[PDB]
Design a protein around this ligand. Structure first.
Ligand SMILES: O=c1[nH]c2ccc(NCc3ccccn3)cc2[nH]1
Length: 330
């Protein structure tokens, strides 16, 4: 089997991407944030504290004839931006772009943190990291991808995120029309539960390529590109007026600037992030200070190839017995 679903930026900055997901019988369609950096499928629901729901579409398990309470199971998760959610668990039928999994753990939110409440466009998350990170207790649950894998034509999914435009998540097949040139595959470590890999280096604009190993994760749930301070300093040094601001929380630059591209290495191959991808707009409405899309990972503890990097590529998440990642230009 296969599935294919369009993913759409939630705003004009591509802060995140939402993908429609059918849950239950009859289908309840929720727009979920497909997150290759986590492993929980959780949704706003009929059980979510009323004051914490503001415009989201909710899953109501009592209206689904295939919903079954997973007795005793609870979940609780916190993300890198400090956001969090928690609740209990149902199993139900979940379909993504025509691909159906029965008995999928659907984690029903009883509580969500303010940043989820304040974002009316995200109805929940669909985790696509490794199931070892799933937070359901006392019985850990599998991701949608893990559950679907045996049924897929090929044990893969692909992320094709758009810049200021819709993109695509495919499951079970590689669309050879969706990229240019060839796909370069690279090794993955699953030891931290992430799609963790090692970039072979970087270039800034038309500068020479610096060969250097950068270990990081392919994380569709993270907006920006977080890289070592040395790398990030070398990038922003090429932007007149750019500076790291403690008060804002990262590198900012004059909105009047033309940003240089950023290249990262995948084996001997190169993925080029156009300068415009690195612009995340005024730090506050009407400001002429703009927030940078490449930021330091110092104090995060890990480098993160977030949407800024991933949307420049066609990315294969290969879930074969030994997982790998593939990157192609597009
Ligand atoms: O690295 C990041 N990923 C993000 C996704 C959405 C956002 N913005 C909206 C949001 C935040 C938290 C919960 C719900 N919606 C910011 C992000 N930063």
């Amino acid at each position: 089997s296969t599935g294919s679903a369009t993913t759409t930026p939630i705003d004009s900055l591509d802060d995140a991407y939402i993908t429609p997901v059918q849950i239950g019988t009859p289908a309840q369609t929720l727009n979920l944030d497909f997150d290759t950096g986590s492993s929980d499928l959780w949704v706003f629901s009929s059980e979510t504290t009323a004051s914490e729901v503001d415009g989201q579409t909710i899953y109501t398990p009592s209206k689904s004839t295939t919903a079954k309470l997973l007795s005793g199971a609870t979940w609780s998760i916190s993300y890198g931006d400090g956001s969090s959610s928690s609740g209990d668990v149902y199993t139900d039928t979940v379909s993504v772009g025509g691909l159906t999994v029965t008995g999928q753990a659907v984690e029903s939110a009883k509580k969500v943190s303010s940043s989820f409440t304040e974002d009316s466009t995200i109805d929940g998350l669909l985790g696509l990291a490794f199931s070892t990170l799933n937070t359901v207790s006392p019985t850990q649950q599998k991701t949608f991808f893990d559950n679907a894998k045996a049924s897929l034509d090929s044990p893969v999914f692909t992320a094709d995120l758009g810049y200021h435009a819709p993109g695509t998540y495919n499951f079970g097949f590689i669309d050879t029309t969706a990229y240019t040139g060839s796909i370069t595959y690279t090794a993955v470590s699953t030891k931290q539960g992430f799609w963790e890999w090692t970039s072979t280096g970087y270039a800034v604009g038309s500068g020479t390529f610096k060969s250097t190993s950068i270990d990081g994760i392919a994380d569709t749930g993270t907006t920006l590109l977080y890289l070592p301070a040395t790398v990030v300093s070398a990038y922003w040094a090429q932007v007149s007026g750019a500076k790291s601001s403690s008060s804002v929380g990262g590198y900012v630059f004059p909105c009047s600037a033309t940003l240089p591209s950023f290249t990262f290495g995948v084996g001997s191959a190169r993925i080029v992030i156009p300068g415009d991808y690195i612009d995340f707009g005024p730090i506050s409405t009407g400001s002429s200070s703009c927030f940078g899309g490449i930021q330091s990972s110092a104090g995060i503890g890990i480098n993160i190839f977030g949407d800024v990097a991933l949307k420049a590529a066609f990315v294969v998440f290969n879930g074969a017995t030994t997982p790998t990642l593939g990157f192609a230009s597009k």
